[PDB]
Amino acid sequence: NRPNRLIVDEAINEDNSVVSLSQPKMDELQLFRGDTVLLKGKKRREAVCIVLSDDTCSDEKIRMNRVVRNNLRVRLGDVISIQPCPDVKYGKRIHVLPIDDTVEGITGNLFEVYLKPYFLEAYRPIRKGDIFLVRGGMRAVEFKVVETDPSPYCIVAPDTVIHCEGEPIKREDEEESLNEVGYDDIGGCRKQLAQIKEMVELPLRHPALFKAIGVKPPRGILLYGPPGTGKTLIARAVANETGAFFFLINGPEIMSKLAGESESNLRKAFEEAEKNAPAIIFIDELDAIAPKREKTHGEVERRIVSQLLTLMDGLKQRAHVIVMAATNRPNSIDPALRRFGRFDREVDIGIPDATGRLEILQIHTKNMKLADDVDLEQVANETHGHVGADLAALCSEAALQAIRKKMDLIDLEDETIDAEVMNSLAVTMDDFRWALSQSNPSALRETVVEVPQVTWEDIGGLEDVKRELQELVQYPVEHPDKFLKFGMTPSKGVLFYGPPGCGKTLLAKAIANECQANFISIKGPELLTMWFGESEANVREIFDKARQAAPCVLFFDELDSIAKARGGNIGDGGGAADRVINQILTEMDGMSTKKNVFIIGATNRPDIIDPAILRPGRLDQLIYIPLPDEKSRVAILKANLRKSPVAKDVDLEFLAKMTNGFSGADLTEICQRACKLAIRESIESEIVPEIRRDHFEEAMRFARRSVSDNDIRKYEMFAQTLQ
């Protein structure tokens, strides 16, 4: 197959010249690690880089930066010709000029602010005509290699010289910008980018394959999520990634025109795209155009919906287009749009979690220098309600908070502000802590869906149950064979019971982390909200999120809460059926038993639970988590205290036997009051970074047990009915 041809691929490295190939791939090419290679891709041109040792990779394909992908005139999923060019060389002279648009509005020397920190100790293989890129000074500036020594064929070591005259060129139509959008710009999204990439991969990248084979690609694709989640940025990125003409319709745009002048604009929009195919028509706000369910008022609006429906199945053949629409809520759309052949494929782009927020923060801070104390983690870890567009504003505020501190007094009077100060201006943690004080913390608050952080090492004791959960969750996805062989059907769910505070909720988040599934937590007050509010129609809306977030574990916490509110043991004259738990059983039964969604209930009042939940096919397995034992109470106290570094004079295992029926909850504040004492005295005596036994034997006074003599045994009197 001539296996010096590889597939291009994205890069996990940001480095301007680097290639990532694993240990085998450099070997079948028989080549070094620090080499200077050569890459001949489509459209006759080439460039040179430093390869690096890689691990993950794949069989054959080459992880590459967007900068080098752009010189070669290549795109992900195309193929490239590498042969080693070990021939070495050292610079005498370079001539590089930047382009006007990327430098516009700047003052003075270009070299020092960028080139001097840039070329140093890189020893990078310049080629002539190479457009590369450098970041700094709260922007990004482009540099091209104009006329050069032993052409093209160069390497930059201190013994080279550099010069730039100061007249920029005007870039032409043959090359594509790095000021446009690509997958690097997107963060907190991998799953959804994955899903979307191969829906649109073959039909865009290879249209003639479908002009042969009789398989039908998807046409409509519908994106979800609250505003500012990046929906427009994900569609525009993909379009500019594959190279398809990206046409953009806006909801208000079409609705602000005169009636019938608008009808022009829907119509002529699509065949405009049919003339340009492959093309992507991105409808900005669709629920502004076609929100028809009850809405349905006036002749004109109804007509514009019906117009769009006709255009969606008027896509018959017509070569290759895609229609990607974005909308806030899936339910505002007219269901006539959803029918097959129109918008069939749906993607849900959620709010980011702490893992992803860090990627977003890094993407928007990459053009500016943070101070040494600044760790984006704390900013990332401490904003729990933000969508992506809130972090883009959070980073812009902190930047100007640095200017309205510092350069405000500098009072540079410039029509073009100086380049040497702006670059030098660095942003501290004190700024981020301020921007987090502003109103951008305000952001949209709804169901959290993520992968829990807590691993088993945060759980003391509970040695049996950690296994039970593994065989209940892990096997039927990871060994589907046997359940076909022997024939049994995997259980749908588990019910934890026991005393309060002993770790029922931890076990749930732990098994989700164990298996890398999504964790959805529905807390008792959110069940009681549906009970008083008399809307149990929302239970159906939870499962349809859990279905869509699969693999998922759906954890109903204090499932006894509605039966307590109506009196429980005494209760009312009625029985144990109520309208929210009824609605769970229903949505539970209609759920696909062959999908990966897994349900965990938890209750500490198992006697008042409705017996209808415990039938086979709903929640089969009762598990009992009791008060921990002296072996475990050690593991608990060890586990909690990793946060604070305890001194060695503190004997926990003595404190263990001091605590008898202390639950995993009761021990946790014993650790926490000592953390009050400590922080107090170091402030108290401020006018020591350890914790001392005298703290604990103080907090000993305040130790309570929340579980009486009957409570512990009443649970046992229950489990004896389970013999």
Ligand X SMILES: Nc1ncnc2c1ncn2[C@@H]1O[C@H](COP(=O)(O)OP(=O)(O)O)[C@@H](O)[C@H]1O
- Is residue 123 within 8 A of residue 155, CB to CB? The reply is yes
Site residues for ligand X, window 152-211 (CB under 6 A)?
185-189
Q: Looking at 505, 521, 561, 583, which residue binds ligand X (CB under 6 A)?
A: 505
Closest CA relative to residue 248, chosen from 225, 273, 218:
273
- Type and span of the H or E element at 565: helix 561-565
- Of residues 337 and 394, the one with the C-beta less far from ligand X: 394
Beta bridge partners of 323: 220, 281
Q: Is residue 163 annotated as involved in ligand binding? A: no
- Chain position carrying tokens 């993950």: 56
**Residue 719 binding partner per list ligand X, a second copy, none, with a CB distance cut-off of 5 to 8 Å that depends on partner kind:** none
Q: Is residue 232 annotated as involved in ligand binding? A: yes
- Of residues 407 and 436, the one with the C-beta less far from ligand X: 436
Q: Looking at 16, 177, 367, 424, which residue binds a second copy (CB under 8 A)?
A: 367
Q: Looking at 137, 220, 251, 501, which residue binds ligand X (CB under 6 A)?
A: 501
Report the half-sphere exposure of 455 (CA within 13 A, side-chain side).
1
Q: Which stretch binds a second copy (CB under 8 A): 113-121, 146-154, 176-184, 667-675?
A: 667-675
Q: Please give the full DSSP string across 661-701, using - where no structure is assigned.
A: S--TTHHHHHHHHHHHHHHHHHHHTT---S--HHHHHHHGG
Q: Does 469 bind ligand X (CB under 6 A)?
A: no
Query: What x/- string results for residues 492 through 511 when contact with a second copy is judged by CB under 8 A?
Result: --------------------
Alpha-helical (H) ranges within 404-454 are 407-410, 419-424, 429-435
Tell whether omega for the bond before 352 is within 30 degrees of 0, i.e. cis. Answer: no
Query: What x/- string results for residues 254 through 293 when contact with a second copy is judged by CB under 8 A?
Result: -xx-xxx------------------------x--x-----
Site residues for a second copy, window 579-638 (CB under 8 A)?
579, 582-583, 585-586, 589-590, 592, 594-595, 612, 616
Distant-in-sequence, close-in-space partners of 419: CB < 8 Å, separation ≥ 6: 106, 107, 108, 109, 110, 113, 137
What dihedral do alpha carbons 136, 141, 144, 149 form, nearest 10°?
-30
Q: Which stretch binds a second copy (CB under 8 A): 62-70, 120-128, 247-255, 319-327?
A: 247-255
Q: Does 51 bind ligand X (CB under 6 A)?
A: no
Q: Does 668 bind ligand X (CB under 6 A)?
A: yes
What dihedral do alpha carbons 550, 552, 557, 563 form, nearest 10°?
40
Q: Does 388 bind ligand X (CB under 6 A)?
A: yes
Q: Is residue 528 annotated as involved in ligand binding? A: no
Q: Is residue 385 annotated as involved in ligand binding? A: no
Q: Does 230 bind ligand X (CB under 6 A)?
A: yes
Q: How far is the CB of 132 from ligand X (least distance, A)?
A: 23
Q: Does 525 bind a second copy (CB under 8 A)?
A: yes
**Residue 227 binding partner per list ligand X, a second copy, none, with a CB distance cut-off of 5 to 8 Å that depends on partner kind:** ligand X
- Type and span of the H or E element at 47: strand 46-47
- Type and span of the H or E element at 120: none
Q: Does 3 bind a second copy (CB under 8 A)?
A: no
- Is residue 25 within 8 A of residue 60, CB to CB? The reply is yes
Chain breaks in the chain (C to N over 2.5 A) after: 687
Q: Does 384 bind a second copy (CB under 8 A)?
A: yes
Q: Looking at 53, 265, 296, 660, which residue binds a second copy (CB under 8 A)?
A: 296
**Separation between Cα atoms, residue 228 and residue 651, nearest integer Å:** 51
Site residues for a second copy, window 158-217 (CB under 8 A)?
198, 201-202, 208-209, 212-216
**Separation between Cα atoms, residue 181 and residue 198, nearest integer Å:** 19
Instruction: Summarize the annotated binding site as residue ranges.
Output: 227-233, 328, 364, 501-506
Q: Which spans of this chain sit near ligand X (rule: CB under 6 A)?
A: 185-189, 227-233, 360, 363, 388-389, 392, 458-462, 500-506, 636, 639-640, 664-665, 668
Instruction: Summarize the annotated binding site for ATP as residue ranges.
Output: 227-233, 328, 364, 501-506
